[PDB]
Design a protein around this ligand. Structure first.
Ligand SMILES: COC(=O)N[C@@H]1CO[C@@H]2C[C@H](OC(=O)N[C@@H](Cc3ccccc3)[C@H](O)CN(CC(C)C)S(=O)(=O)c3ccc(OC)cc3)C[C@H]12
Ligand SMILES: [Cl-]
Ligand SMILES: [Cl-]
Ligand SMILES: [Cl-]
Ligand SMILES: [Cl-]
Ligand code: NA
Ligand code: NA
Lengths: 99, 99
């Protein structure tokens, strides 16, 4: 698809058997999802942005479906205000910025 | 151009005659720049990012060039960790997300 940016670029994702709404975020290096459980091992990480840092759990090799397109990669889980699909997964679905 | 997302989508901007680096950020509603002086009056605004909310200075109708494209619109000034071009100016330069 071609998504214009008059409004927030929200899409439906499937992660851990759950449907969620998430923001396609070119300014995010990583993918950060609100608290949920995911299977497998994880390790703690700190990520920072406007407002400062939050502690998250880093899960590797997690499959997501993003607007119908499957990807795999690292997902960070923690107290993010918004679910964010960052570049680590946007690349996998072939997303580009065009102007 | 067509910008892929394997690296951060950093571009050169020009504001107040000065070149700066900024991130093209589809997850940002608003454009937020590090401390600098801009002309005119400002208005207060709070913005909420991943670590919580910060105070910024809102300057309206600021001339800004983004990757060679001319925009005139609102710029927020405050303690952001990187200069971010948000949707208010991405729309002015004609940017879309495509996959
Ligand atoms: C509901 O809250 C809002 O809608 N806030 C507003 C949305 O737009 C206004 C400007 C600010 O936007 C953001 O902070 N946007 C966030 C992504 C974002 C968006 C929204 C909330 C938190 C984080 C960014 O797109 C991604 N961020 C990085 C940039 C600040 C460099 S981030 O979320 O902090 C971030 C940081 C690290 C990371 O992986 C390492 C992944 C993401 C905040 C306000
Ligand atoms: Cl919106
Ligand atoms: Cl990854
Ligand atoms: Cl590619
Ligand atoms: Cl504007
Ligand atoms: Na894993
Ligand atoms: Na002004």
């Amino acid at each position: 698809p071609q998504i214009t940016l008059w409004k927030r670029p929200l899409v439906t994702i499937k992660i851990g058997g759950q449907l969620k709404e998430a923001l396609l975020d070119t300014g995010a290096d990583d993918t950060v999802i609100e608290e949920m459980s995911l299977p497998g091992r994880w390790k703690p990480k700190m990520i920072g942005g406007i407002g400062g840092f939050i502690k998250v759990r880093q899960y590797d090799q997690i499959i997501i479906e993003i607007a119908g397109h499957k990807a795999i990669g690292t997902v960070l889980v923690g107290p993010t205000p918004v679910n964010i699909i960052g570049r680590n997964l946007l690349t996998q679905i072939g997303a580009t910025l065009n102007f």
